[PDB]
Amino acid sequence: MIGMDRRSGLPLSGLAHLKQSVEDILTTPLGSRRMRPEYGSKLRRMVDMPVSEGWKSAVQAEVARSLGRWEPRIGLSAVRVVAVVDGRVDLLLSGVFEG
Amino acid sequence: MIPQTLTNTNLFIDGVSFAGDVPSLTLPKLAVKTEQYRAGGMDAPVSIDMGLEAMEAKFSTNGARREALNFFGLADQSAFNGVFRGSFKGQKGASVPVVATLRGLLKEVDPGDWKAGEKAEFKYAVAVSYYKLEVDGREVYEIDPVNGVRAINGVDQLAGMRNDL
Amino acid sequence: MIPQTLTNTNLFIDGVSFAGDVPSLTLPKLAVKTEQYRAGGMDAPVSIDMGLEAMEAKFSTNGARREALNFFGLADQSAFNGVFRGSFKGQKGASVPVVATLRGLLKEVDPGDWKAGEKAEFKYAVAVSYYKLEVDGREVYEIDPVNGVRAINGVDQLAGMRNDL
Amino acid sequence: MIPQTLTNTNLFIDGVSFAGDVPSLTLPKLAVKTEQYRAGGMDAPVSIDMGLEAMEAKFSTNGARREALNFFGLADQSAFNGVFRGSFKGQKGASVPVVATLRGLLKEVDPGDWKAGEKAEFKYAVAVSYYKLEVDGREVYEIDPVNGVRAINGVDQLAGMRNDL
Amino acid sequence: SFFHGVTVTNVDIGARTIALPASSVIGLCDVFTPGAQASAKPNVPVLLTSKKDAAAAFGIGSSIYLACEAIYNRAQAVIVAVGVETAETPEAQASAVIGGISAAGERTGLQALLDGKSRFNAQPRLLVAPGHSAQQAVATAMDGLAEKLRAIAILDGPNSTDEAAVAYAKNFGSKRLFMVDPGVQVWDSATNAARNAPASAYAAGLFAWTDAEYGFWSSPSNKEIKGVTGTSRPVEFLDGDETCRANLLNNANIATIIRDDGYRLWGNRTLSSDSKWAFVTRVRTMDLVMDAILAGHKWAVDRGITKTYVKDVTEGLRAFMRDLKNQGAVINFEVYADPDLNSASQLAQGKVYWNIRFTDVPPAENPNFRVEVTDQWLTEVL
Amino acid sequence: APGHSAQQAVATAMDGLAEKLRAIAILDGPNSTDEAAVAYAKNFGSKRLFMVDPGVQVWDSATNAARNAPASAYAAGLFAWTDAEYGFWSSPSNKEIKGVTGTSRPVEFLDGDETCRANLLNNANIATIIRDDGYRLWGNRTLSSDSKWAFVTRVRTMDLVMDAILAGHKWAVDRGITKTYVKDVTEGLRAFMRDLKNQGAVINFEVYADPDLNSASQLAQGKVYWNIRFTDVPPAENPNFRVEVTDQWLTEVL
Amino acid sequence: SFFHGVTVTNVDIGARTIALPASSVIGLCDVFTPGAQASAKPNVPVLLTSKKDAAAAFGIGSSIYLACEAIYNRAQAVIVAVGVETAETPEAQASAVIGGISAAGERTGLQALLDGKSRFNAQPRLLV
Amino acid sequence: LLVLQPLTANAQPFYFNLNTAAFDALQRNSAYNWSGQVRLGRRPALQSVGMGEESILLKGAVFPLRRQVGNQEKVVGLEQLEALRRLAERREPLILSSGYGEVQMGLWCLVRISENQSALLGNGAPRKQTFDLEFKRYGDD
Amino acid sequence: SGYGEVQMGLWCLVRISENQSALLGNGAPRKQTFDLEFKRYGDD
């Protein structure tokens, strides 16, 4: 499938379109889209919550829901905390490719 | 804490005293009914406070006491009462009266082996339907099976379970 | 290694010391729950680390201690704490403080046979919900049943099972 | 044959020696799993070589040995190794070194009754995942559960079962 | 200036220098351009794990990255990459790759791969000079550096015809050399045509894919090459000992890419004069158990010789080599202390000997199939 | 004295203060190459000096850069570490170093009797640092021209079994010599040496009074003599593994 | 010089069948070639322990080792083995393998097997 | 431990952990629809005529007097299995979200809830609730 | 198989049913007792 890039307007198809397809899921909140209320992630609700070991398993369980809806060509493997600086947690979104 | 221990004991059945009769006692084994809770994620199974076991108070008698044999198998429960008493002396002579007022049903009578030269024993057993232990003068246990009052140290623990829900 | 062994012991319940009371202890039997794995090709069944058994810590008391009998059957678990201590002397006098901080629920009280001349014993039992053994000053065991931290020699072994998967 | 018997013993855990600690051993009970085969025509049921039972090696320790308590319940099997040694003297002084190199998983730790005057004992148990007995210098047993090599007197008996079929 | 929302990050974050598989670390030496886009000094080693590390330390058009991409397309490997400044004379270009102690106290060229350990915990096991191994002076440099390093050097022949590469293999026989002569070609995005890669780095990425996914004891010949198209020479192959250009190279101890023009490597024998050390799996399992013996038994250089110490490691090795035996890395072995050469005259000197005897698994390069039929015991028809 | 031991005049005062104190004096080298570090160790050879030439560079949190520590305090904190549980009899020549990064110069041990940078510096009786980012120490041998006192362990054991005896024998000096005075302390020297055999400090010893030097004329001036001849554990600096690939157990694969 | 650390060598050794019952000793005598690799004088006895010093005292292709490999194939005993220089005529070879007191104060040939004890503490009970 | 979450995507999900339900058993039946057709003189022919019902059954027990972890002044509730019931009368499939192998399990409709609540208090409050949930895989496109 | 006849026929797989228990924190079991169930595909 051939789509266009979000910035700079260039049509990119293979796997750069795959990565921006995921980051339109993860950063859109629910109900922000027009006439598509069941689109996006609850990750903005997980913004600025304390990083516990139940916060990690609630992000894995919510990325898997939101990518399971509107990204069928990605099989999610794991989400892991790899570093912590002040506020900035960072997550290695790893997943196999299907489709 | 000074070392204390049992030195002498006593037993009452419906007021009268067995002041020269009983060689043995057994207060009822207070044991909580535990259910092994291991689940997803947790490693070792925990045990949960989920009620008490069957209380049963053995006592023993060397002679044919009509006052003890009167209360076997009566049609009314808690007709037997019984009061078990102990005295714990301490190291400095400060004797501590351990009194346990139970009100159960008398459950079992077995006059055992009546050998000729050997003394005989009448083992008794009491299906305890009420239990109340007092260490010095203060009430430690007060176990109502049929009522919802399990008082540990004078405060009801079953009442606190209803306020939590 | 110099020969060492137990010489004396001690016991704490919620801060107060049973410094003249307890004749006996039992730290909880740490036992792994083993499932016999024999399969196609393999000869003898191996046993697999698949969780711990039910920890239970007996201790015993000769006198009516109100501090020990207070904590039976409370509506909150881990209201009983308890601290069991030992002292292992060695051959050259280097005594080694073995302290075991548990935080379980008190499970069973049975004042046994109250014979007249014979001393009485109050056996106790503790449904252990937390266990922590320290040999000298260093933390050997730290068993969280309800949490996912089974620390052997200070490193969590349950955390290493999650990194392997 | 001259009369020989055990006089002294020793124990190694991961290299270090328990040269003053262990009062007791138990090498694992080697037992074949027998199925009773009686059939049409035959009178008494025969027992058939159909695999070994669960090997388990008890050993015991009187003091708090951090080297022994380190290996309980580790996330990797065969992290515990252990080496059990004996010395059988004979009638003419010809001592025979019986060494048994096992490589199991440590299964059970129970510090028993910590009475005050009585010495304490830490019973251990090892879920044996490898066993290798040597009588003098020659290898008698070599039991691989997880591999297909049951070597009796240095020759694999499980390999001979595959050549027969 | 922080940020308070959900964000995507496309740059590297975590460290992966913790694992470090000791059997698959690769020494790499070729030219590059040390500009401002290449953040690495020329004659120093630098640790690499991914293509982003090769992009940051070297140029994209530089032939270091063309060899780093050749390895990282196949395996998740670790590369100790040294660079050389490109010269004018090709006989002086080979003088830059061999290096030496031409500086004050710094090793340059291939000799800086000896400084892999004490910099990044990588004692290199695979030596490649992509393109700079058709010259004999560097193939002799990679020869003599190999037994210092206990590695094998994956050199390559010239991209001419077969007897130009068979006669180039006759200058060796030194047990440490694995030559793959057809320089395989790869598709390019910018050129939109067929390239010319020297195909010595592709065998290094295949060895790092073999020893981590199949074990180092497994023969790394019959396995897939990625990032590949046809070869520079169509090399035919049949079954039945013909005049094929596959059997001609393999009998000359030369490996070659064979089937479907780029699909698989083919051949496992090394440039060795001894038939005992003919296979690479005889050579790889010689050095990768005896440095895996040491890894874990690093306590054998201290804890001085007491009565139990000679006895401590003589089943310290027996318990470790039975772990090698059970995972298939060897077949049955024996480990025992040396009875006669161990003496108290040199035990005070520090020397104490152990005898290791193991046989390893043979690679089934030629399975024969004697087919026979019967009904119960004999051929009933004839 | 980190950094100052690279000077010749300081290291000689570091030398002569060690024989007055029965101590191991850890020296340094320059930041320069291996040839200028071997030449710094040739003029020594006085049985008490321990040279570590590679400049240990270490990260700091103040300026966020890499310093250059002169390698003395890391070996000093390692000699004091191996006496805590491995004992003074053990060798600290393959032990780990915490709080460390790489060296100023690379130095590695390889095999085959080539020009190894470690073997060139061990043969000059100088310790190095081998594995990644300051991971090990590598020297067993002191700067000693005498072949008997080569290893660090024999120099430390002879200096640290005596203060383990001279403490515990604060008595047996200015006491007063009775008839069984010599016997009651030579049975006390044995009892304070059998525990050293018990903890693995020595191999089998002998302690006995000197029969011919002890005399009646020596008692009048307070001089009494003993013989505490013992032996020590040699550190296994060279474990040799004789290894081949046979084809013996090839009939196992059938 | 010396070496620090583990130095992994590469040698050629056989099976570890060197377990030695000191029960029977063998007196042996055959011809050989006293080369540089054969570290044994001709008419003196050499105590042998295994094949590793039977290959060190006498050569591989020597007729001692062909008659000494056959013993260690079955029993790993200890051998009091004397050598003899080979001869041209078979009568002088038969006279040399016997030997005698023809030296200054030594015994040559088979007679050097009488010096088993007080040299080796092994009086040969098997004469071949 | 496991996460139930519906198709409306704004409703509150159910989280399985030691505070809420904490199952320790997991049956996963998965048939495969091979239909047999009996032929007269030979073996019956088998044809793959579909996929069949794949089901997941969650055992376990809720003890609604054990306090929440770390003693949060709050117990495991009696409400905390009826939340499984309210989430099941939505007539709606659910995404299972584990955390060990595959994380994106499919759409799983909830079919059966059956608790066995005993050891009662005075007002009928149990202190054990042994349940068994039972799912079937909703076959989406 | 590898013991009697080696060429067993065509066997279609019909049922998989695991019982995964003794769970970890993230739902990971440490036992998976299964029972597979085949039926012989009747080829020509």
PDB file of N, CA, C and O in Angstrom, chain C residues 1-2 4-7 24-25 29-30 32 36 38 42-43 45 49 88 138 140-141 150 152-153 157, chain D residues 21 33 51-52 54 64-67 69-70 72-75 107-109 113-116 119 145 150 158:
ATOM      1  N   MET C   1      35.752 -24.977  57.787  1.00  0.00           N
ATOM      2  CA  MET C   1      34.744 -24.231  58.530  1.00  0.00           C
ATOM      3  C   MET C   1      34.691 -24.707  59.971  1.00  0.00           C
ATOM      4  O   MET C   1      34.699 -25.907  60.235  1.00  0.00           O
ATOM      5  N   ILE C   2      34.654 -23.758  60.899  1.00  0.00           N
ATOM      6  CA  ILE C   2      34.594 -24.075  62.322  1.00  0.00           C
ATOM      7  C   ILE C   2      33.208 -24.624  62.641  1.00  0.00           C
ATOM      8  O   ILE C   2      32.225 -24.239  61.992  1.00  0.00           O
ATOM      9  N   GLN C   4      29.759 -24.772  64.198  1.00  0.00           N
ATOM     10  CA  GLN C   4      28.810 -23.924  64.897  1.00  0.00           C
ATOM     11  C   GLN C   4      27.477 -24.641  65.007  1.00  0.00           C
ATOM     12  O   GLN C   4      27.191 -25.581  64.263  1.00  0.00           O
ATOM     13  N   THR C   5      26.657 -24.153  65.932  1.00  0.00           N
ATOM     14  CA  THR C   5      25.407 -24.788  66.319  1.00  0.00           C
ATOM     15  C   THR C   5      24.625 -23.814  67.183  1.00  0.00           C
ATOM     16  O   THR C   5      25.170 -22.824  67.672  1.00  0.00           O
ATOM     17  N   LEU C   6      23.347 -24.117  67.381  1.00  0.00           N
ATOM     18  CA  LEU C   6      22.489 -23.251  68.176  1.00  0.00           C
ATOM     19  C   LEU C   6      22.771 -23.449  69.653  1.00  0.00           C
ATOM     20  O   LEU C   6      22.879 -24.582  70.125  1.00  0.00           O
ATOM     21  N   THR C   7      22.862 -22.346  70.384  1.00  0.00           N
ATOM     22  CA  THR C   7      23.023 -22.377  71.830  1.00  0.00           C
ATOM     23  C   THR C   7      21.862 -21.748  72.573  1.00  0.00           C
ATOM     24  O   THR C   7      21.416 -22.294  73.579  1.00  0.00           O
ATOM     25  N   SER C  24      10.676 -23.432  72.357  1.00  0.00           N
ATOM     26  CA  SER C  24      10.733 -24.084  71.061  1.00  0.00           C
ATOM     27  C   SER C  24      10.425 -23.081  69.964  1.00  0.00           C
ATOM     28  O   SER C  24       9.674 -22.125  70.164  1.00  0.00           O
ATOM     29  N   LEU C  25      11.025 -23.312  68.803  1.00  0.00           N
ATOM     30  CA  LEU C  25      10.724 -22.581  67.587  1.00  0.00           C
ATOM     31  C   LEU C  25      10.564 -23.553  66.437  1.00  0.00           C
ATOM     32  O   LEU C  25      10.875 -24.740  66.544  1.00  0.00           O
ATOM     33  N   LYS C  29       9.139 -24.153  56.828  1.00  0.00           N
ATOM     34  CA  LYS C  29       9.784 -25.076  55.906  1.00  0.00           C
ATOM     35  C   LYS C  29       9.729 -24.501  54.501  1.00  0.00           C
ATOM     36  O   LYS C  29       8.671 -24.494  53.863  1.00  0.00           O
ATOM     37  N   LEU C  30      10.859 -23.998  54.025  1.00  0.00           N
ATOM     38  CA  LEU C  30      10.953 -23.541  52.649  1.00  0.00           C
ATOM     39  C   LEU C  30      11.075 -24.749  51.734  1.00  0.00           C
ATOM     40  O   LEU C  30      12.067 -25.480  51.792  1.00  0.00           O
ATOM     41  N   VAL C  32      10.182 -26.064  47.613  1.00  0.00           N
ATOM     42  CA  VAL C  32       9.727 -25.732  46.271  1.00  0.00           C
ATOM     43  C   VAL C  32       8.696 -26.764  45.824  1.00  0.00           C
ATOM     44  O   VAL C  32       8.772 -27.950  46.169  1.00  0.00           O
ATOM     45  N   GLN C  36       6.758 -33.644  38.615  1.00  0.00           N
ATOM     46  CA  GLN C  36       7.596 -34.684  38.032  1.00  0.00           C
ATOM     47  C   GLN C  36       7.509 -34.624  36.516  1.00  0.00           C
ATOM     48  O   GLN C  36       6.465 -34.928  35.931  1.00  0.00           O
ATOM     49  N   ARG C  38       8.804 -36.379  33.523  1.00  0.00           N
ATOM     50  CA  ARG C  38       9.387 -37.351  32.621  1.00  0.00           C
ATOM     51  C   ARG C  38       8.560 -37.359  31.349  1.00  0.00           C
ATOM     52  O   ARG C  38       7.344 -37.158  31.370  1.00  0.00           O
ATOM     53  N   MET C  42      13.412 -39.300  27.755  1.00  0.00           N
ATOM     54  CA  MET C  42      14.155 -39.124  28.989  1.00  0.00           C
ATOM     55  C   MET C  42      13.779 -40.216  29.982  1.00  0.00           C
ATOM     56  O   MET C  42      12.655 -40.724  29.987  1.00  0.00           O
ATOM     57  N   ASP C  43      14.749 -40.594  30.810  1.00  0.00           N
ATOM     58  CA  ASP C  43      14.641 -41.805  31.616  1.00  0.00           C
ATOM     59  C   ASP C  43      14.035 -41.526  32.988  1.00  0.00           C
ATOM     60  O   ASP C  43      12.975 -42.060  33.327  1.00  0.00           O
ATOM     61  N   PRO C  45      12.417 -38.980  35.939  1.00  0.00           N
ATOM     62  CA  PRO C  45      11.693 -37.705  36.008  1.00  0.00           C
ATOM     63  C   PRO C  45      12.492 -36.655  36.766  1.00  0.00           C
ATOM     64  O   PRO C  45      12.989 -36.905  37.865  1.00  0.00           O
ATOM     65  N   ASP C  49      11.450 -26.275  39.364  1.00  0.00           N
ATOM     66  CA  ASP C  49      11.159 -25.113  40.196  1.00  0.00           C
ATOM     67  C   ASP C  49       9.865 -24.475  39.713  1.00  0.00           C
ATOM     68  O   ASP C  49       9.847 -23.802  38.678  1.00  0.00           O
ATOM     69  N   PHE C  88      24.353 -18.555  66.913  1.00  0.00           N
ATOM     70  CA  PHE C  88      25.160 -19.733  66.605  1.00  0.00           C
ATOM     71  C   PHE C  88      26.609 -19.412  66.942  1.00  0.00           C
ATOM     72  O   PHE C  88      27.201 -18.522  66.328  1.00  0.00           O
ATOM     73  N   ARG C 138      23.557 -10.170  56.657  1.00  0.00           N
ATOM     74  CA  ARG C 138      23.223 -10.127  55.244  1.00  0.00           C
ATOM     75  C   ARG C 138      21.937 -10.902  55.003  1.00  0.00           C
ATOM     76  O   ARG C 138      21.669 -11.901  55.675  1.00  0.00           O
ATOM     77  N   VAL C 140      19.555 -13.309  53.388  1.00  0.00           N
ATOM     78  CA  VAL C 140      19.621 -14.511  52.562  1.00  0.00           C
ATOM     79  C   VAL C 140      18.307 -14.740  51.835  1.00  0.00           C
ATOM     80  O   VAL C 140      18.262 -14.799  50.601  1.00  0.00           O
ATOM     81  N   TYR C 141      17.222 -14.890  52.583  1.00  0.00           N
ATOM     82  CA  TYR C 141      15.905 -15.103  52.013  1.00  0.00           C
ATOM     83  C   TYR C 141      15.061 -13.853  52.202  1.00  0.00           C
ATOM     84  O   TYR C 141      15.215 -13.115  53.177  1.00  0.00           O
ATOM     85  N   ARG C 150      10.827 -12.939  45.112  1.00  0.00           N
ATOM     86  CA  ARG C 150      11.475 -14.007  45.861  1.00  0.00           C
ATOM     87  C   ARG C 150      12.975 -13.773  45.790  1.00  0.00           C
ATOM     88  O   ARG C 150      13.624 -14.178  44.820  1.00  0.00           O
ATOM     89  N   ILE C 152      16.584 -14.435  46.747  1.00  0.00           N
ATOM     90  CA  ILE C 152      17.570 -15.358  47.283  1.00  0.00           C
ATOM     91  C   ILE C 152      18.915 -14.669  47.157  1.00  0.00           C
ATOM     92  O   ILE C 152      19.310 -14.289  46.047  1.00  0.00           O
ATOM     93  N   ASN C 153      19.596 -14.485  48.294  1.00  0.00           N
ATOM     94  CA  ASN C 153      20.877 -13.776  48.399  1.00  0.00           C
ATOM     95  C   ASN C 153      20.773 -12.339  47.882  1.00  0.00           C
ATOM     96  O   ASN C 153      21.712 -11.812  47.284  1.00  0.00           O
ATOM     97  N   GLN C 157      14.686 -13.766  42.233  1.00  0.00           N
ATOM     98  CA  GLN C 157      14.731 -14.879  41.294  1.00  0.00           C
ATOM     99  C   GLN C 157      13.491 -14.902  40.410  1.00  0.00           C
ATOM    100  O   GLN C 157      13.521 -15.451  39.303  1.00  0.00           O
TER     101      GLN C 157
ATOM    102  N   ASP D  21      30.897 -29.514  59.456  1.00  0.00           N
ATOM    103  CA  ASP D  21      29.511 -29.072  59.540  1.00  0.00           C
ATOM    104  C   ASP D  21      28.496 -30.196  59.435  1.00  0.00           C
ATOM    105  O   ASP D  21      27.558 -30.245  60.236  1.00  0.00           O
ATOM    106  N   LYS D  33      11.573 -48.197  38.090  1.00  0.00           N
ATOM    107  CA  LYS D  33      10.117 -48.135  38.073  1.00  0.00           C
ATOM    108  C   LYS D  33       9.589 -49.438  37.489  1.00  0.00           C
ATOM    109  O   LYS D  33       9.724 -49.690  36.288  1.00  0.00           O
ATOM    110  N   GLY D  51      12.482 -47.674  33.525  1.00  0.00           N
ATOM    111  CA  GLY D  51      12.867 -46.343  33.936  1.00  0.00           C
ATOM    112  C   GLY D  51      13.125 -46.248  35.427  1.00  0.00           C
ATOM    113  O   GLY D  51      12.741 -47.108  36.220  1.00  0.00           O
ATOM    114  N   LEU D  52      13.783 -45.164  35.813  1.00  0.00           N
ATOM    115  CA  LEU D  52      14.156 -44.947  37.201  1.00  0.00           C
ATOM    116  C   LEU D  52      13.153 -44.034  37.893  1.00  0.00           C
ATOM    117  O   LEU D  52      12.368 -43.331  37.255  1.00  0.00           O
ATOM    118  N   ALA D  54      12.333 -41.018  41.043  1.00  0.00           N
ATOM    119  CA  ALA D  54      12.817 -39.672  41.310  1.00  0.00           C
ATOM    120  C   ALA D  54      13.991 -39.731  42.273  1.00  0.00           C
ATOM    121  O   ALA D  54      13.843 -40.176  43.415  1.00  0.00           O
ATOM    122  N   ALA D  64      24.254 -22.319  60.530  1.00  0.00           N
ATOM    123  CA  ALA D  64      23.791 -21.462  59.445  1.00  0.00           C
ATOM    124  C   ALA D  64      24.923 -21.288  58.454  1.00  0.00           C
ATOM    125  O   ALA D  64      25.765 -20.399  58.610  1.00  0.00           O
ATOM    126  N   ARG D  65      24.954 -22.134  57.437  1.00  0.00           N
ATOM    127  CA  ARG D  65      25.952 -22.031  56.391  1.00  0.00           C
ATOM    128  C   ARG D  65      25.359 -21.256  55.231  1.00  0.00           C
ATOM    129  O   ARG D  65      24.387 -21.695  54.609  1.00  0.00           O
ATOM    130  N   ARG D  66      25.941 -20.087  54.977  1.00  0.00           N
ATOM    131  CA  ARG D  66      25.491 -19.225  53.896  1.00  0.00           C
ATOM    132  C   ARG D  66      25.736 -19.872  52.540  1.00  0.00           C
ATOM    133  O   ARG D  66      25.009 -19.607  51.579  1.00  0.00           O
ATOM    134  N   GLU D  67      26.740 -20.746  52.453  1.00  0.00           N
ATOM    135  CA  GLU D  67      27.039 -21.422  51.196  1.00  0.00           C
ATOM    136  C   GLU D  67      25.980 -22.463  50.858  1.00  0.00           C
ATOM    137  O   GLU D  67      25.740 -22.756  49.682  1.00  0.00           O
ATOM    138  N   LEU D  69      22.659 -22.271  52.146  1.00  0.00           N
ATOM    139  CA  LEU D  69      21.380 -21.580  52.022  1.00  0.00           C
ATOM    140  C   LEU D  69      21.325 -20.670  50.803  1.00  0.00           C
ATOM    141  O   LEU D  69      20.257 -20.129  50.500  1.00  0.00           O
ATOM    142  N   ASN D  70      22.448 -20.481  50.108  1.00  0.00           N
ATOM    143  CA  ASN D  70      22.483 -19.622  48.930  1.00  0.00           C
ATOM    144  C   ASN D  70      21.746 -20.253  47.757  1.00  0.00           C
ATOM    145  O   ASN D  70      21.197 -19.541  46.912  1.00  0.00           O
ATOM    146  N   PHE D  72      19.041 -22.247  47.450  1.00  0.00           N
ATOM    147  CA  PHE D  72      17.644 -22.656  47.509  1.00  0.00           C
ATOM    148  C   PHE D  72      16.819 -21.870  46.501  1.00  0.00           C
ATOM    149  O   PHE D  72      16.829 -20.635  46.513  1.00  0.00           O
ATOM    150  N   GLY D  73      16.096 -22.590  45.647  1.00  0.00           N
ATOM    151  CA  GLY D  73      15.069 -21.994  44.805  1.00  0.00           C
ATOM    152  C   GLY D  73      15.574 -21.020  43.766  1.00  0.00           C
ATOM    153  O   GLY D  73      14.911 -20.014  43.489  1.00  0.00           O
ATOM    154  N   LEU D  74      16.740 -21.289  43.191  1.00  0.00           N
ATOM    155  CA  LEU D  74      17.274 -20.415  42.164  1.00  0.00           C
ATOM    156  C   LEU D  74      16.524 -20.626  40.854  1.00  0.00           C
ATOM    157  O   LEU D  74      15.985 -21.701  40.584  1.00  0.00           O
ATOM    158  N   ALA D  75      16.497 -19.573  40.034  1.00  0.00           N
ATOM    159  CA  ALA D  75      15.727 -19.592  38.798  1.00  0.00           C
ATOM    160  C   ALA D  75      16.313 -20.532  37.758  1.00  0.00           C
ATOM    161  O   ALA D  75      15.591 -20.956  36.850  1.00  0.00           O
ATOM    162  N   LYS D 107      16.016 -28.379  46.889  1.00  0.00           N
ATOM    163  CA  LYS D 107      14.570 -28.544  46.880  1.00  0.00           C
ATOM    164  C   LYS D 107      13.882 -28.084  48.154  1.00  0.00           C
ATOM    165  O   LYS D 107      12.787 -27.531  48.081  1.00  0.00           O
ATOM    166  N   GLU D 108      14.495 -28.279  49.314  1.00  0.00           N
ATOM    167  CA  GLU D 108      13.772 -28.118  50.565  1.00  0.00           C
ATOM    168  C   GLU D 108      14.746 -27.718  51.655  1.00  0.00           C
ATOM    169  O   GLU D 108      15.815 -28.317  51.782  1.00  0.00           O
ATOM    170  N   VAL D 109      14.385 -26.693  52.422  1.00  0.00           N
ATOM    171  CA  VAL D 109      15.135 -26.266  53.599  1.00  0.00           C
ATOM    172  C   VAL D 109      14.151 -26.187  54.754  1.00  0.00           C
ATOM    173  O   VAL D 109      13.196 -25.408  54.697  1.00  0.00           O
ATOM    174  N   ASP D 113      13.044 -27.989  64.921  1.00  0.00           N
ATOM    175  CA  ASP D 113      12.687 -27.517  66.250  1.00  0.00           C
ATOM    176  C   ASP D 113      13.898 -26.821  66.862  1.00  0.00           C
ATOM    177  O   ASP D 113      14.869 -27.477  67.248  1.00  0.00           O
ATOM    178  N   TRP D 114      13.850 -25.491  66.945  1.00  0.00           N
ATOM    179  CA  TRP D 114      14.890 -24.733  67.642  1.00  0.00           C
ATOM    180  C   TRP D 114      14.593 -24.700  69.141  1.00  0.00           C
ATOM    181  O   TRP D 114      14.163 -23.694  69.708  1.00  0.00           O
ATOM    182  N   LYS D 115      14.842 -25.829  69.790  1.00  0.00           N
ATOM    183  CA  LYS D 115      14.850 -25.831  71.241  1.00  0.00           C
ATOM    184  C   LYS D 115      16.117 -25.145  71.742  1.00  0.00           C
ATOM    185  O   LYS D 115      17.097 -24.990  71.010  1.00  0.00           O
ATOM    186  N   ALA D 116      16.089 -24.725  73.007  1.00  0.00           N
ATOM    187  CA  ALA D 116      17.169 -23.897  73.536  1.00  0.00           C
ATOM    188  C   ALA D 116      18.441 -24.710  73.754  1.00  0.00           C
ATOM    189  O   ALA D 116      19.473 -24.451  73.126  1.00  0.00           O
ATOM    190  N   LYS D 119      20.740 -28.927  70.184  1.00  0.00           N
ATOM    191  CA  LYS D 119      21.325 -28.388  68.966  1.00  0.00           C
ATOM    192  C   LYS D 119      20.291 -28.355  67.844  1.00  0.00           C
ATOM    193  O   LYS D 119      19.353 -29.154  67.808  1.00  0.00           O
ATOM    194  N   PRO D 145      19.102 -38.003  33.713  1.00  0.00           N
ATOM    195  CA  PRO D 145      17.663 -38.004  33.452  1.00  0.00           C
ATOM    196  C   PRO D 145      17.348 -37.315  32.139  1.00  0.00           C
ATOM    197  O   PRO D 145      16.717 -37.909  31.266  1.00  0.00           O
ATOM    198  N   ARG D 150      22.128 -43.600  30.611  1.00  0.00           N
ATOM    199  CA  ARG D 150      22.177 -44.247  31.914  1.00  0.00           C
ATOM    200  C   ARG D 150      23.336 -45.227  31.898  1.00  0.00           C
ATOM    201  O   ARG D 150      23.186 -46.364  31.438  1.00  0.00           O
ATOM    202  N   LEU D 158      20.837 -47.456  28.219  1.00  0.00           N
ATOM    203  CA  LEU D 158      19.752 -46.962  27.379  1.00  0.00           C
ATOM    204  C   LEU D 158      20.123 -47.031  25.905  1.00  0.00           C
ATOM    205  O   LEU D 158      19.245 -47.120  25.039  1.00  0.00           O
TER     206      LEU D 158
END
